[PDB]
Amino acid sequence: APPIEVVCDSRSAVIERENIMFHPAMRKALFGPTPSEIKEASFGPRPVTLYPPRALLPAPDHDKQRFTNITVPSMAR
Amino acid sequence: PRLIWCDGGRLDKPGPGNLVAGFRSKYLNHMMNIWTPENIRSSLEGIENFTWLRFVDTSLQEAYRASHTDVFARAVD
Amino acid sequence: HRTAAHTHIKGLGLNSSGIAEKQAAGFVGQCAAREACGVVVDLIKAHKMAGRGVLLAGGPGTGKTALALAISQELGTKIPFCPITGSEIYSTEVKKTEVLMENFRRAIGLRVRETKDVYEGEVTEMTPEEASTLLIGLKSARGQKKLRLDPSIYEAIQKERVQVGDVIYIETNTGACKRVGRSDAYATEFDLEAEEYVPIPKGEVHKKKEIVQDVTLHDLDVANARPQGGQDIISMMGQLMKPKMTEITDKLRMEINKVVQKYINQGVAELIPGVLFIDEAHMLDIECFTYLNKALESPIAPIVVLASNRGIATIRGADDLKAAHGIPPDFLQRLLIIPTHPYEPDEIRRIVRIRAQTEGVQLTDAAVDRVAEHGVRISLRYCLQLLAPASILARVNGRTQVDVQDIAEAEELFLDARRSANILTSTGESGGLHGFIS
Amino acid sequence: ISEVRGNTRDHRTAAHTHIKGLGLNSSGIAEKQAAGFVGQCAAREACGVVVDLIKAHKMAGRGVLLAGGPGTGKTALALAISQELGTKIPFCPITGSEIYSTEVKKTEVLMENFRRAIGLRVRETKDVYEGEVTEMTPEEAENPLGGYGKTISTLLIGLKSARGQKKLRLDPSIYEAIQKERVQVGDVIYIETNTGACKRVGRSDAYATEFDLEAEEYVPIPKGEVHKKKEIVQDVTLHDLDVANARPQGGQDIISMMGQLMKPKMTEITDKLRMEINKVVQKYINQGVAELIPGVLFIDEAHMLDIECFTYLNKALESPIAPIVVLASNRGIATIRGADDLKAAHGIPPDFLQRLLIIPTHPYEPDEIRRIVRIRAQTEGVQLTDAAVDRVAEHGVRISLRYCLQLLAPASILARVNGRTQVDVQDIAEAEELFLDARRSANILTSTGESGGLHGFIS
Amino acid sequence: GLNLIAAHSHIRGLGVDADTLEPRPSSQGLVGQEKARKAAAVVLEMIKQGKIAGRAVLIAGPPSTGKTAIAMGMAQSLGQDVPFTTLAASEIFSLEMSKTEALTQAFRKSIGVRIKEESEIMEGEVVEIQIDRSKQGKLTIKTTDMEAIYDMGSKMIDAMTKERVMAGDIISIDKSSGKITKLGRSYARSRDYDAMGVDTKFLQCPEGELQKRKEVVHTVSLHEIDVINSRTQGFLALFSGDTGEIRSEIRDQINTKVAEWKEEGKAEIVPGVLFIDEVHMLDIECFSYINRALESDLAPIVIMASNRGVSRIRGTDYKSPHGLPLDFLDRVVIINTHPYTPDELRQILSIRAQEEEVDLTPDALALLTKIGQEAGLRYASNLITTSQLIAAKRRAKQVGVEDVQRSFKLFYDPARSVRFVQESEKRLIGNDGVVDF
Amino acid sequence: GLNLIAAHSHIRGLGVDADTLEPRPSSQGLVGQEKARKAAAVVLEMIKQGKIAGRAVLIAGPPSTGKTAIAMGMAQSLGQDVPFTTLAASEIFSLEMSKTEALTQAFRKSIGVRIKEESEIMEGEVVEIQIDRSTGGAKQGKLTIKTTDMEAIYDMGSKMIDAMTKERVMAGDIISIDKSSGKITKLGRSYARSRDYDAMGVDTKFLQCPEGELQKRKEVVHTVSLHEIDVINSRTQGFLALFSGDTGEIRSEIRDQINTKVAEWKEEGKAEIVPGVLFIDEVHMLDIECFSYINRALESDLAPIVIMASNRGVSRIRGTDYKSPHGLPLDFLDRVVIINTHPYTPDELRQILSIRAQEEEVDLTPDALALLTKIGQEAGLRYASNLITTSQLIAAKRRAKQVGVEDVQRSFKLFYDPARSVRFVQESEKRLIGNDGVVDF
């Protein structure tokens, strides 16, 4: 299921939903840097830091099925 | 409704009608706070409470950022 | 205006010389207890108090908590008053000697005066001046006005989605901003945009008002321990990361006293010591009368009005000692004990009249005697709980005032505890298929 | 920065300061008044046999009980064993009221204390290049790759320690260290040998004044070698291996950077992990690298363990890798705490008691209390006359042993306040009324404290 | 100003002679308890010496006799140097940490580590940030007296960038570590902006020399070192309370390093005082740990109080003197107290009068002495405030016989409350039944 | 579909008259009980008044005498207006939180706030959508819609075109563009474009075009309790807690501030407070630690009326050891007002069995109904009400239409009433585990 949301019919409720339930600072901190940011950090004249210094997503501990639930038949069977 | 979720039902949204939430935010998070660097710098010289802060590898700004973010943003730091 | 069990209590009803007068301000009789509670109210207002204990004796049915609400409305809205029962001290997240200190820190009050300068109005331009400072013109329906912003409040405007002509609400002092909506002059720019189109405010742009407002020290303790509300976004998980009550150590309170005394010495805030009303103190066990005997000896502790109705009972948590009031005599010598005597039959009728003219239920004098008969012969809490159903049996049968017949019907529709015990024992004789299961 | 004080480096007097060992012969026969003890011959001989059992590595799950009344010397024998074994063999002195936790089951803190009691000694080597960087000078290759710019075959680093400097030729894939760690001229680094990726420690102290405000840590020059080929003995308890395999210390993600950021919680450890760690430690012993060293788990006050704990102790002592369990019980016929049914000896269940080598402990003679008083007095430094020694021995025989060892500190204070240097009879006769024992306190409590009234106690 | 007149406010130290240990009667608040105060003076003089580790001193006696008064006198007559810890026994029974660890932390708080050092800090108000985009830069800082221009090289320009320092801030640099700590803005730039932000707090300008060096004497406890080394950012745990069962290997490493600091002359160990108030609330599961924690070198001189007579021990079902097990009472030393003569009661009420600035006629003082002899101290001391307040209601300066009799008439002493309960048993809920008239 | 016949699916209200409060003997399901239903009618008419505190009415009586029946009648005779909350008194003993606070939340769940504010919505079939994404983006576009009456063209903002490709509005959908927020709830599909839908099921519902104007204002009425606002103002996004129970100890200053703002909402006329009903089923399962809190939560202005039901006679109180009537302490029995019920006369038993038979639609011969009344005289209502459902099925075994004596006498033969079960236990002692012994033949 998706998480329960609030049906409140103002614009502020939609803005607060898209700033809490999505909250792009944590998404940027979790997945990593934009390739434009990689280019401007790797063609510059001086070394500069990145706010996600590497991709902070943890490595999944199951190789064939990571972070989803969507499986498929197995050529084995 | 748009009264509770947006206007003045939330005790944190400092809209009109929720006249407390500006004052309470400022005078609990920045004036009367024991982690602001002004209220640390006066208590660092002996038996007092932030005696130890000189010896842990921090600074005043390290402690002040560490005492207002989440567990998330502190982990990104 | 809805009736509670203590709606008719307005104040203690004293003289100018501190002498109680009968049938005053809602009370009927009960002279010495109201005189003693008046002395208690004067002690709280005198500000020479760093922990005093007041116990209220007397059985159930007498007016113990009516005295406490009389004190709470005698102090006013200014001085804080925290009523907690004994059973609220038990938790599953903190120890029960820490919820006591949380109630003591909810008792003390800290009053701060502010002059909030609010800014309603439509944004006219968003002009970054330096290359930093960004001017904003706030157009009202009375006139626009320029405004120079700090480079940190602009990063709070910019997090909100304010673009061209959104009406906003800037706090000047606390720096708090809210986007109210899009102004109706730019309403039909497109035709199915999705905003909240609100009109331009037809007042000032710079409204200056002052607000007196209170803060309890427990709120200071919580706001200095853990980040609260504003930037605490990881709490939406819930399991381990929720704002669980944590063991606030003595070092944190010992520093918050330093900071609050600093802001009192600057003349910013004012200090007001409060009242902690712990009701039904027999539910407090001996692992808390040990801690109260220490925590009342601080130079910061508020006054504690304890209430207890029991006789010589067993102190909870230590089954091998009996004591008066359920209070250990280690602690009972601290307390100022006030008696609360029962009610004479000529002092119940006035309670019936006052409780009747509180609910609006008017009734003849031949029924006041019957309600007083049930008040003498059964109980006081029961006779006062027949004035409201009998009025329901009054306006249904084509009447306005309550006669003897409606109360004679309500005494059969609404049995008390005593006659129900008699039916439970005598009528419910055999324990079988159609009997009660003891 | 930190100012050093030139004061006297003394030590503090505890209750077991004077104990310095068992004081045996070369044949095991005890000798009275030696190394702190006075008398107590058979118990010291049996504890010497226990010490020999521990140092002989034949103990693999034994159990030793210390009976005897309170104030007779069980903890004294325990500290004597711990100081006799030394420091390089572990010793974990838990109590009975320390297994009760609120994060784990109480049959788990026992197993973690077993793992604290076992040590593992590992002998290895350490090969590092060390010191402050002077040059980072590349060298152009002989055959550059077509289609690229620079082609560098060997990168040169000049490392300068505090004793001698050295030029170093390296494989060019040190560059990914140097760009990621920001190593410059004047930064001490160490280069390992198994991988070869340098990690900066800090800016040196010689370059602490080229700028004025731009400051970080200014670590000094490594005052040692430039090519360490140094061997290391390393002692790790098996508790540390259990913790480091169960809860990993340093990770690179969000949730392990919340795990070390939130509070560390004791968690129960599954038995497959312990079985695997035992199976691999017993393999590295057979390779001849690591030495297993068993220690002592002195569970003091063993009558506080309830009947649910001895059941787990039977399993844990039947394990092939287990230390000795020196219990300490001072009760006679007692009710076991868990099952309130059986009145057993010592608080120990009769099933568990058969495993235990029961060592007795006898009361002290009325001419040995004065020798203990003399040793305790010359331990603290408090000197006193012989009639004072006889009076303290009188109080020791007639009242208690622990009470005559506590009339030495207020007597010394009143002595050097009154204006003397040694303690006489008058100071002890004055200090005996400022510090009552338990007996006269109970006499005042019963006689004067008649009943609960105004000026009375609360029964 | 967060300091109101409590019960323990007139006791400014122990009040004995420091030369020959003679407890003169009326000195520093305390009155007439000469033998117990002499014994507490001997205890205090072996505390400040600090050599003899881990004793245990029980203070028995009836209630309302002065067992916490002598403890607060010993707390006041040590100063801020030697620590002290007021822990009532019901604080130990927690739901996040067990009894053993929450009582170990009571021992770990009462031993201080004292270390003296030199703080090389730099206050200053920023005037002009000058960055040379060529790496180098120049910082201009001023105080109320001086003004200087310091060079900057590469990376603290980036620290300024990460801190967003504007012209007008109050920065502070710890040059032994090198990290910018922005303290806020100055009052000279409050006229500049109009709508301030949230984070900005205004401060005065720094005064004096820029480079401030000062010898400061830090004193931490071992509990501070234990909690800081618990987890990564664990320093806020000792303010919050978000810590639990700390492992024994951390405490072992910390005790080893404190011994190593004492060897190398960096640190000085100052043993202190643990005060376990109302020790009879501890169960046997706690005394079995106290009997071992008083054995190590790092153990404070424990002072404990008690009230109860021959009572049961909590956790078990057998009576014992003072509510303590006898294997623990063989280890402690006991200082008994005694009830008060009326000659001492009169001047104790006089001291409680002059503390609360309440004037008393001598007849009222004699009447209040008789009330204190017939009811106790805690009821007699609670009648000074009430008589003063009733005198304030009828507008009289000095309290009199009438006001004290009024206060005795209104409020009940605990001697008459028992007769009030036993007089009317049918209405108070005894154990089963209520009449309700 | 989720309307399976329960043990109380025949009660359609309290059944009493609302003009003279006369309990007419057979209406809306509740049949037979007269004096207790009149007292419940009086309590019900003083609930909807609102001008009374939280008081306490104790429905005491023997087992199976219609106590949950009267409570469910009062629940059905209020509608979805005044908040009725059931609370079996063993939901309080939790582990996520304490016990007194779990009781406080159940008090706060029954004080509604009813506020009424307007929205602007749009009905109508989409005629066509054109979106100018040409590399371009969501910049401009035209939306042509219609009702049966209206027809219109609108131009769209960027943050509306991003909601049109979000819901994938086709040419023929029946959408509801809430204008103030921008959400799109497709009410269905129009019938007239049934050819234009290929990626749908073979069985797919189709609506008609909406009738009336295309731009109208709705006066929706919301009603949320104080516990709702308490859980909302407790975390960052904390309303999920009241759907997952993960709320903990809510600090009391939040409840105090919300009790202040509700009064400030009432005095400004923006709101209205509706006191609800809290039904504490089986109140004898509370220890004295609960009663020492219910004695004071029934004191404030904001307290719902508590209705509660007790079976026990003179029994012990949990937590303590001393007995008391109804399992309740006497200082709490001073607060409550007791309604006593009575056992049922046999003709009332017969017509209650008649209502339970007509509810499940089971045909009965009058001889079988007489036998079933004779059984219910000796074994209670629950046994006979289960024999009805058993006897219908036993008649359906042998392919019959109406049940008879030959099926009630089989249901009475297989399924023992509890009196004969107690006799079976008393006459089979040595094999049933009493406390100690097991004998095997």
Ligand SMILES: Nc1ncnc2c1ncn2[C@@H]1O[C@H](COP(=O)(O)OP(=O)(O)O)[C@@H](O)[C@H]1O
């Ligand atoms: N002097 C009084 N005048 C009017 N009503 C009173 C008076 N004393 C008591 N009451 C009534 O008593 C009831 C409260 O009893 P309470 O004090 O709560 O008993 P307890 O404190 O034992 O629970 C209230 O309904 C109030 O109307």
Ligand SMILES: Nc1ncnc2c1ncn2[C@@H]1O[C@H](COP(=O)(O)OP(=O)(O)O)[C@@H](O)[C@H]1O
């Ligand atoms: N043989 C001994 N020689 C010297 N001192 C002793 C001896 N036996 C006991 N003591 C002293 O007696 C004191 C109390 O003995 P203790 O070890 O507490 O008994 P237990 O082991 O029963 O607790 C200790 O301080 C110890 O110094």
Ligand SMILES: Nc1ncnc2c1ncn2[C@@H]1O[C@H](COP(=O)(O)OP(=O)(O)O)[C@@H](O)[C@H]1O
């Ligand atoms: N010798 C004394 N001189 C003056 N005041 C005293 C003296 N002894 C006790 N008091 C006062 O009596 C009160 C009771 O002492 P305390 O130790 O609290 O009794 P308890 O031991 O029963 O707790 C204290 O508030 C203290 O101020």
Ligand SMILES: Nc1ncnc2c1ncn2[C@@H]1O[C@H](COP(=O)(O)OP(=O)(O)O)[C@@H](O)[C@H]1O
């Ligand atoms: N007046 C009534 N009208 C219709 N059915 C009733 C009536 N009274 C009781 N019942 C039926 O009897 C059964 C028992 O009632 P209930 O209130 O559940 O018993 P208890 O009070 O023991 O919970 C219910 O299933 C209900 O259907």
